[PDB]
Amino acid sequence: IVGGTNSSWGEWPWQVSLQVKLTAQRHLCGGSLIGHQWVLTAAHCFDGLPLQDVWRIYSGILNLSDITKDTPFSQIKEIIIHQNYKVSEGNHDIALIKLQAPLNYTEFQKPISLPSKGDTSTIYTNCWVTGWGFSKEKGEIQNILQKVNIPLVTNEECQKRYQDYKITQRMVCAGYKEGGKDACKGDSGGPLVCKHNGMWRLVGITSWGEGCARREQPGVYTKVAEYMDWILEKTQSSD
Amino acid sequence: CPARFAALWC
Ligand SMILES: N=C(N)N1CCCCC1
After folding, report:
1. A30 C-beta neighbours (distance < 10 Å), count
2. Using CA atoms, how far apart are residues A197 and A153, in angstroms rounded to an integer?
3. How far is CA A106 from CA A10, A17, A61, A100, A170, in A?
4. Are residues A122 and A205 in the same domain?
5. What is the DSSP string of A27-80?
6. Residue A134: CB partners within 8 Å, gap ≥ 6?
7. A129 and A209 housed in the same domain
8. Which residues of A touch B9 (CB under 8 A)?
9. What values do phi and psi take at A66, rounded to 5?
10. Is A99 helix (H, G, I), strand (E, B) or coil?
11. A133 CA → ligand 1 middle, Å
């Protein structure tokens, strides 16, 4: 996260850190707890990965340097990557992770609410993006979970900054014309959440953008509302 | 993954 600040406990209780351990352990991506055994993230977080035994999923963690050998973590039971996701194209950048055991809910470990199918994002005026990603281009993973407030931009305005990618109805964009606030490397798969009438909901999944926090280059997010049939079908069929 | 994406080796 570029231009963000340090979060406090319980602000973002759905945020998880998706890490791998081979010989060393590292944070790779963010995710959102959406059910007691389900995390929602980006499909591209699985590109160039070994099988799922490598993954350690941390929830109820604010600060990655607070993690020790004895910190509990979740392991993966199933990975469901959207059937029509193709890496060079980038559309349908969405994936479900089923955990090996359900998590008990606490004030620091709770699921984010999901939107309805058919939702126009025009009612969301207070949106935030969180993660442990770089704080600048060519930067480094941050220890304390970062938060930043970013306005949504219309798909029409977003499309002007991105020839030659098509910005589809299944994407949502967010950024400042002047730049300086954005998601960055290591924030993939994390939440774009908006607060409406006292409650937070997941509007987007952190996906792509040009560099980080550049002028006139908004971040692009998978629009969760446009995949709610898929999310419901896949989690029900699995469960 | 293409460079516009945010994983560490994109
Ligand atoms: N929002 C931006 N700039 N991103 C999305 C996450 C991957 C890196 C680029």
Report:
1. 31
2. 21
3. 9, 17, 12, 19, 32
4. yes
5. EEEEEEEEETTEEEE-GGGGTT---GGGEEEE-S-SBGGG--TTS--B-EEEEE
6. A2, A140, A141, A142, A184, A185, A186, A187, A212
7. yes
8. 48
9. -75, -15
10. strand
11. 9
Method: X-ray
User: Residue A18 belongs to what H/E stretch?
Assistant: strand A15-21
CATH number at residue A66: 2.40.10.10
Residue A183 alpha carbon, nearest atom of ligand 1: 1
Is residue A209 lining ligand 1, measured as CB closer than 6 Å? yes
Which residue among B5, B8, B9 places its CB closest to the CB of A208? Answer: B5
The residues near A230 (Cβ < 8 Å, ≥ 6 apart) are A82, A94
- The stretches of A52-210 forming alpha helices (DSSP H) are 155-160
The span from the CA of B3 to the CA of A96, in Å, is 23
Residue count (chain A) = 239
Distance in Å, CA A211 to ligand 1 centroid: 7
CB A130, CB A206: distance < 8 Å: no
Domain residue limits at A199: 1-12+112-226
User: What is the C-alpha separation between A16 and B4, in angstroms, rounded?
Assistant: 23
State whether A116 and A2 are in the same domain: yes
A139 in B contact zone (CB under 8 Å): no
Tally of domains in chain A:
2
Q: What are phi and psi of A192, to 5 degrees?
A: -110, 110
Kindly give the distance from the C-alpha atom of residue A109 to the centroid of ligand 1, in angstroms, as a whole number.
25
User: Residue A206: CB within 6 Å of ligand 1?
Assistant: yes
Assess whether the C-beta atom of A188 lies below 6 angstroms from ligand 1: yes
